[PDB]
A = this chain, B = another copy of it.
Amino acid sequence: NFMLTQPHSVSESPGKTITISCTRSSGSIASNYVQWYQQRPVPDRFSGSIDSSSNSASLTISGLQTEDEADYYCQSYDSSNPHVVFG
């Protein structure tokens, strides 16, 4: 899958950031995740409860294959040359 779940703030920054190319992924994730992120460049209270959690991630591939003749030709080209003038 593609869980692109990122609450990110971007200032004036002409670039490319995340770039994924020619990647193969296959796995299982079971996560109980708690985060308090505080950035201050008055009272703060954080309460997080997960309680009883049952996370199951099962992947089964019972395959059989004869002659494959596999040719995995993955070519990736990425060019990023921004031209930014501030005035």
Contact A80/B77 with A30-B29, A72-B72 known, Cβ cut-off 8 Å: no
Report the interface size for chain A: residues with CB under 8 A from the other chain.
87
Contact of A22 among B31, B38, B53, B76 (CB under 8 A): B76
In terms of DSSP, what is the predominant structure of the interface of chain A? strand
**Could you list which residues of chain A lie within 8 angstroms of chain B, going by C-beta atoms?**
1-87
Chain B residue with Cβ nearest A70: B70
A35 to chain B: closest residue by CB: B35
Choose from B23, B53, B83 the contact partner of A20 (Cβ within 8 Å): B23
Chain B residues in 8 Å Cβ range of A9: 8-11, 39
Given A50-B51, A54-B55: A2 touches B5 (CB 8 Å cut-off):
no
